[PDB]
Design a protein around this ligand. Structure first.
Ligand SMILES: NS(=O)(=O)c1ccc(CCN(Cc2ccco2)C(=O)CN(CCC(=O)O)CCc2ccccc2)cc1
Ligand SMILES: [Zn+2]
Length: 257
């Protein structure tokens, strides 16, 4: 029922999910002058060498690549995190135009898209239990700007024709998510939430400072996806981003001076 349109978009979500007006909702604007360097943060550890991708799918609000999280293969540790977080899936949020699409903003600047690599804290045993914990998930957020192509994204782009409509999926094995990362792991971090219903307040956000560049042709292919299912009226999957939410009683910490 929820979506991104006028009658079911983010301004309506609170009716079914009252935590939408909660104390640690995401995304937020990152005010770079107020975020404070935290020398206590340890270096991020992104260990994706053994990642095992499974499928790519259109779920009606984004497209997502899933991973086998049956074992400690692709894991995120360090930075603000205590313990080990397993990669479950990645997906994107994007705009109808290059000047919008990201969920987080930087000094109110919106990027053309935002990649979310979703990880869960293995101390809770399974992701369903983790989403009920304030420290259950860690999402690594990476901004996309339009410029040069990202070679590591092309395998994704070239299969989107096969999952145009909600409910479609395809095999997507042997995809290496390391090809989606920027050079620098400098980041901002803050406690927040899922940015789609149920908006659970279970996420440590780690947002990389350095965007990746993708080409206009790559992002154009994102915008040809459909929110609707096959055999329904075509509604292009664009502007599937939640806007910045109030920061409230939170501090955004920087890993870098
Ligand atoms: N944009 S964001 O902030 O990065 C972002 C926004 C939403 C989510 C979804 C997180 N959630 C919650 C959810 C609930 C409904 C929809 O979603 C799940 O992952 C749920 N689920 C699917 C995992 C999978 O198979 O992928 C786990 C399976 C499970 C097992 C036992 C009991 C309950 C659930 C992730 C990132
Ligand atoms: Zn997301």
């Amino acid at each position: 029922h929820w979506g991104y349109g006028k009658h079911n978009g983010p301004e309506h979500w609170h009716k079914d999910f009252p935590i939408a007006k909660g104390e640690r909702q995401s995304p937020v604007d990152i005010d770079t002058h107020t975020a404070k360097y935290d020398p206590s943060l340890k270096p991020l550890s992104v260990s994706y060498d053994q990642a095992t991708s499974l499928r790519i799918l259109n779920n009606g609000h984004s497209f997502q690549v899933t991973f086998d999280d049956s074992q400690d293969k692709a894991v995120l540790k360090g930075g603000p995190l205590d313990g080990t977080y397993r990669l479950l899936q990645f997906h994107f949020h994007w705009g109808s135009l290059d000047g919008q699409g990201s969920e987080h903003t930087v000094d109110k600047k919106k990027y053309a898209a935002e990649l979310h690599l979703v990880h869960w804290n293995t101390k809770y045993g399974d992701v369903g239990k983790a989403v009920q914990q304030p420290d259950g998930l860690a999402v690594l957020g990476i901004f996309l700007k339009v410029g040069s192509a990202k070679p590591g994204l092309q395998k994704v782009v070239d299969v989107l024709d096969s999952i145009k409509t909600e409910g479609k999926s395809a095999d997507f094995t042997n995809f290496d998510p390391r090809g989606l990362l920027p050079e620098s792991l400098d980041y901002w971090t803050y406690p927040g939430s899922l940015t789609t219903p149920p908006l659970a307040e279970c996420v440590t956000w780690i947002v990389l400072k350095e965007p990746i560049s993708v080409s206009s042709e790559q992002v154009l292919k994102f915008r040809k996806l459909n929110f609707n299912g096959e055999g329904e009226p075509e509604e292009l999957m664009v502007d599937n981003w939640r806007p910045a939410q109030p920061l409230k009683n939170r501090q955004i910490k920087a890993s870098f001076k």
